[PDB]
A paper describes a structure:
Microtubules are hollow tubes made of parallel protofilaments formed by the head-to-tail assembly of αβ-tubulin heterodimers (tubulin). As a result, microtubules are polar structures, with a (−) end where α-tubulin subunits are exposed, and a faster growing (+) end, terminated by β-tubulin subunits. We present here the selection and characterization of αReps that target the tubulin α subunit. αReps are artificial proteins based on a consensus sequence of a HEAT-like repeated motif initially observed in thermophilic microorganisms (Guellouz et al., 2013, Urvoas et al., 2010). In this work, we have selected α-tubulin-specific αReps. These binders prevent tubulin self-association by targeting a surface that is involved in longitudinal interactions in tubulin assemblies, with different implications for the two microtubule ends.
The structure of tubulin-iiH5 was similarly determined to 3.2 Å resolution. There are three, virtually identical, complexes in the asymmetric unit (pairwise root-mean-square deviations (RMSD) ranging from 0.39 to 0.50 Å; approximately 1010 Cαs compared). Indeed, iiH5 makes a 1:1 assembly with tubulin. It binds to the (acidic) longitudinal surface of the α subunit. It interacts in particular with the T7 and the S8-H10 loops and with the S9 strand. iiH5 also interacts with the N-terminal H1-S2 loop.
Numbering used by the authors:
A (entry chain E): 2 to 279, 284 to 437
B (entry chain F): 1 to 44, 47 to 360, 369 to 441
C (entry chain I): 13 to 166
Write the structure that this text describes.
């Protein structure tokens, strides 16, 4: 019946307020939490209460927590347009950040704040009749995004066992890249979180930067441009959980349908249409575009891999017959290779609520949209890119002294890489 | 990671240190009485890094002014921004080191050091979250070198969790005709290799060459050299002073720039290089700025970048310019020069664009490089030292001031080791 | 008034998202003319149209909707059943007390809860009598709802 959202570090926090901006707009909630009869969504039945608690006033408060080891990013939330929406105890900040060092976010600095964060989550969990689990937002490359998330994921497994933990991860890019050591932090977080996450949706900063330049025509896309797009995709993924829809309703339906092997839990999300506000696309067109590598959240070639799962989540002006017709052409016309032991079944969901766009945002308002979730072998390409970068620096032990001096053992680097090697072999072997 | 505590030691330290304050105070919109008289909101956003908000609307530099020569005290206070410094923060002796390292590190300097540590303790307390320390000094003298490195060691032992960064000016026969300078420089480099996290190598040989060969300054003064230093210190600390992502704090910059703890000596650079008051002419483009970043003639340390490989590079562009232009020009410079960049350090060249340009310039570029070619700088000092130390010439001036000959041998060993280390990574392949 | 005729003809329309959007609209405005067409949409082919017609009929309140909503508590779709139960709770007609009590033994948690909430909203005297009888001769969840109602009512 309820989900808690945890936003860790700069990326996670900044994405969280872009997500929450869209959630409010989608469910007809004002920045103060009020949902008045003029702004109420209309068509009765609403399951947004999985993400928003209701105060005695009639104020809808996000079941969200924002954590950063420095105050800069959350101060913007506290002074922003949504200052009124969240309660002060939900927004947690330190003084000294993790300085793009995993060991600071996991050990030294992270250990100082872990206990408070847990009590702040406990305040939210205590307001849930039947808490399903957590949605964790963070970067791979920041010291807090990598280090503190893995430390928190570890502690949430102990403190909340039979509770799902689905991630939204900021995969690094050389374009928006504030650190050299991001490959180290990425391998370290993925190693320690692997046994604690149930599902992980990666967002490759290079893909969104490419999408903004190609589809939205932004010359040099900023964090503002990327985030409006991330939140559009993320909303389409989480829509199942906030709406009275049939496919991927609870966090368990999401795990059951999308993940057949436990370690191999990284679904690749695609989204169409991503149009700049500057021409109407049909169900056939938007379904077809899901199978185009250009429109993917993560850079990878699905024609080089095998699928284990394939879900299509449509929203807006989407007719059942048109969806069936579109799927039928994709089965007969495309070269979509599935693994032997799993059936070639496209799980389809349709929500007739029109797409909600960001006012003042770079995205145009479309009649229909689609978010495809594919569990493909091709995502091992994202791991390989990262693993090679890691190997280059690690062989000469460059920057390692920064980690060993911050409560970490050098062997945890070799142990981490070994887990990545196994993960890469697993994707290879599963795709025969 | 907010506040930065500044310490300036000796003649050079106080001269170059005062020019740094004069320049960044003007940038942050501060007059010599400490009142903010600017227009941009961005000028005061990260003001708490280098200034304390003493009293009302007034700003104070978090600066500690040290020298064993008391003459320096009046020079600073009678200067342009002399009235903004805390009167209690001036710690001055009545003697002088007479360009003896042993006099600043053990005798006269060690007497005054505790009084300085009292002042640094005072400033560290009115600090919400101290980032670290920044020392402005000369390696060629006695005070800045000996007392300055005693201070570094004393601060390192007191504040070990804090970053220790320096702006060390390298001696040159072209600038100073003092004979024992290689001893003072070698003995200081030995301290810096162990007790600093980041050292900006400001070579007086490169400063002279830029003025003589390019600026056409017939016989430059220290005022001409210090114009290059103040402009460099202004550009290298830009990230720390204005709101930004890349290398915002001392630790975040240290993480990106330092792969190995001993290889923390940076070759700074600036573009455009304008002579002191030479009427602003010809507006540079992003490609002209990017080209002047790599150009050996624009380096503040006397080393050819083409004689080594870059381990890490931090580029800072200032002013109103296209982000597409900077991204385009920094990508070409790396591909069309792949051979001069270490292959085993992915994405080692980090770019930054700050919309506030420096005084008198509509656009500028600052370069911070961790190039293996900086071994040329240390080799020059070692050669200079060896000629003298072989004969054990003028060693009595140091050993008489409570120093040992093994200290000279240890300094020489460490500096030769550092050069060998730079060579190993220059020859290192990804394979 | 001028737009009420439009959405009533969109409720008939071929396109399922258009039929859904017509039912969402007639609940947002809520005119007495929309009662009988929304009653027909309770028997729609699509569950997303049926559940929002049910939510619309509960908001408007018209007594003519009480009978089709009673039959809607037996709809194959869990969301349609929950929305029909809640609609009957909004209307508050005592004819719904016994069909809502039968919904207390539904396989879906939301439907059971929605039936419990609806009964509490009607809270007449026939509800009370049925709660008294269920508190003594009742089992599990259905017994808890009878016992909770009589303790929330001194
Ligand atoms: N798309 C996106 N990426 C971001 C954003 N902010 C930072 N990043 C990326 O995330 C990585 C840096 O990690 P951060 O999230 O900033 O770091 P952090 O979690 O705050 O940790 P510390 O820096 O150690 O305090 C780089 O890949 C950045 O480009 C954002 O709002 N959106
Ligand atoms: N660029 C520059 N170098 C200086 C300045 N003053 C002294 N030096 C150099 O610093 C060295 C001497 O150090 P100095 O500061 O005079 O000695 P101290 O007072 O004992 O620290 C020589 O190599 C000088 O060339 C100055 O203002 N600018
Ligand atoms: Mg941060």
């Amino acid at each position: 019946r309820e989900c808690i959202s945890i936003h860790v570090g700069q990326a996670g926090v900044q994405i969280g307020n872009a997500c929450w901006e869209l959630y409010c707009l989608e469910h007809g909630i004002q920045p103060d939490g009020q949902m008045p009869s003029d702004k109420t969504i209309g068509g009765g039945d609403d399951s947004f209460n999985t993400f928003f608690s209701e105060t005695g006033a009639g104020k809808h408060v996000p079941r969200a927590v924002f954590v950063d080891l420095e105050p800069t990013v959350i101060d913007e939330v506290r002074t922003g347009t949504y200052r009124q929406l969240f309660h002060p105890e939900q927004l947690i900040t330190g003084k000294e950040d993790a300085a793009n060092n995993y060991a600071r976010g996991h050990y030294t600095i992270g250990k100082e704040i872990i206990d408070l964060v847990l009590d702040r989550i406990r305040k939210l969990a205590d307001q849930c009749t039947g808490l399903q689990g957590f949605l964790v937002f963070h970067s791979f490359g920041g010291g807090t995004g990598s280090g503190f998330t893995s430390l928190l994921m570890e502690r949430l497994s102990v403190d909340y066992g039979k509770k799902s933990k689905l991630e939204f991860s900021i995969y690094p890019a050389p374009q928006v890249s504030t650190a050299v050591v991001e490959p180290y932090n990425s391998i370290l977080t993925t190693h320690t979180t692997l046994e604690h996450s149930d599902c992980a949706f990666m967002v490759d900063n290079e893909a969104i930067y490419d999408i903004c330049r190609r589809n939205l025509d932004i010359e040099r896309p900023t964090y503002t441009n990327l985030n409006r797009l991330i939140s559009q995709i993320v909303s389409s993924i989480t829509a199942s959980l906030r709406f009275d829809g049939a496919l991927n309703v609870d966090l368990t339906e999401f795990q059951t349908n999308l993940v057949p092997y436990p370690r191999i839990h990284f679904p690749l999300a695609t989204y169409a249409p991503v149009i700049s506000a500057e021409e109407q696309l049909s169900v056939a067109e938007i379904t077809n575009a899901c199978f185009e590598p250009a429109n993917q959240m993560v850079k990878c070639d699905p024609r080089h891999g095998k699928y284990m799962a394939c879900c299509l989540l449509y929203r807006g002006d989407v007719v059942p017959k048109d969806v069936n017709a579109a799927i039928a052409t994709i089965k007969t016309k495309r070269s979509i290779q599935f693994v032997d032991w799993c059936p070639t079944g496209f799980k389809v969901g349709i929500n007739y609520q029109p797409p909600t766009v960001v006012p003042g945002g770079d995205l145009a308002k479309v009649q229909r949209a689609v978010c495809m979730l594919s569990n493909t072998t091709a995502i091992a390409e994202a791991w390989a890119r990262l693993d090679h970068k890691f190997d280059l620096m690690y062989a000469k032990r460059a920057f390692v002294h920064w980690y060993v001096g911050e409560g970490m053992e050098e062997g945890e680097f070799s142990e981490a890489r070994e887990d990545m090697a196994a993960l890469e072999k697993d994707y290879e072997e599963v795709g025969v | 990671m907010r506040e930065i505590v500044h310490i300036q030691a000796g003649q050079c330290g106080n001269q170059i240190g005062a020019k740094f304050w004069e320049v960044i105070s003007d940038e942050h919109g501060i007059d010599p009485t400490g009142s903010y008289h600017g227009d941009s909101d961005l000028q005061l956003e990260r003001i708490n890094v280098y200034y304390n908000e003493a009293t009302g609307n007034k700003y104070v530099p978090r600066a500690i002014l040290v020298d064993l020569e008391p003459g320096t005290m009046d020079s600073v206070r009678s200067g342009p921004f002399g009235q903004i410094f805390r009167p209690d923060n001036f710690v001055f002796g009545q003697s002088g080191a007479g360009n003896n390292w042993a006099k600043g590190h053990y005798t006269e300097g060690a007497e005054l050091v505790d009084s300085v540590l009292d002042v640094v303790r005072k400033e560290s307390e009115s600090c919400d979250c101290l980032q670290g320390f920044q020392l402005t000094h000369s390696l060629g003298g006695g005070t800045g070198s000996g007392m300055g490195t005693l201070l570094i060691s004393k601060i390192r032992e007191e504040y070990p969790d804090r970053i220790m960064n320096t702006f060390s000016v390298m001696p040159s026969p072209k600038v100073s005709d003092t004979v024992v300078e290689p001893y003072n420089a070698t003995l200081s480099v030995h301290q810096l290799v162990e007790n600093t996290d980041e050292t900006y190598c400001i070579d007086n040989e490169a400063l002279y060459d830029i003025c003589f060969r390019t600026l056409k300054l017939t016989t430059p003064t220290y005022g001409d050299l210090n114009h290059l230093v103040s402009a460099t210190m202004s550009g290298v600390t830009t990230c720390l002073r204005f709101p930004g992502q890349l290398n915002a704090d001392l630790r975040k910059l240290a993480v990106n720039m330092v792969p190995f703890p001993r290889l923390h000596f940076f070759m700074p650079g600036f573009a455009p290089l304008t002579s002191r008051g030479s009427q602003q002419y010809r507006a540079l483009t992003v490609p002209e700025l990017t080209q002047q970043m790599f150009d050996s003639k624009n380096m503040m340390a006397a080393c050819d970048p083409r004689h080594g490989r870059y381990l890490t590079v931090a580029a800072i562009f200032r002013g109103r310019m296209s982000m597409k232009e900077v991204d385009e020009q920094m990508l070409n410079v790396q591909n069309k020069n792949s051979s001069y960049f270490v292959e085993w350090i992915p994405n080692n060249v980090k770019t930054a664009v700050c919309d506030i340009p420096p005084r008198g310039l509509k656009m500028s570029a600052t370069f911070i490089g961790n190039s293996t070619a900086i071994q040329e700088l240390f080799k020059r000092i070692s050669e200079q030292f060896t000629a003298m130390f072989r004969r054990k010439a003028f060693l009595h001036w140091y050993t008489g001031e409570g120093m040992d000959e093994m200290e000279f041998t240890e300094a020489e060993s460490n500096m030769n080791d550092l050069v060998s280390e730079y060579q190993q990574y220059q020859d290192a392949t990804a394979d | 008034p001028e737009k009420v005729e439009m959405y009533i003809k969109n409720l008939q329309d071929d396109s399922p998202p258009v039929r859904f959007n017509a039912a969402v609209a007639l609940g947002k405005i809520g005119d007495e003319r929309a009662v009988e067409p929304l009653i027909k949409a309770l028997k729609d082919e699509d569950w997303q149209v049926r559940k929002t017609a049910a939510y619309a009929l509960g908001k408007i309140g018209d007594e003519r909707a009480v009978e089709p909503l009673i039959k809607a508590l037996k709809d194959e779709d869990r969301y349609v059943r929950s929305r029909a139960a809640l609609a009957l709770g909004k209307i508050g007609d005592e004819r719904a007390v016994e069909p809502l009590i039968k919904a207390l033994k539904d396989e879906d948690e939301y439907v059971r809860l929605s039936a419990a909430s609806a009964l509490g909203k009607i809270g007449g005297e026939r509800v009370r009598a049925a709660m008294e009888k269920l508190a003594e001769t009742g089992t599990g969840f259905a017994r808890k709802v009878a016992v909770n109602y009589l303790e929330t009512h001194k």
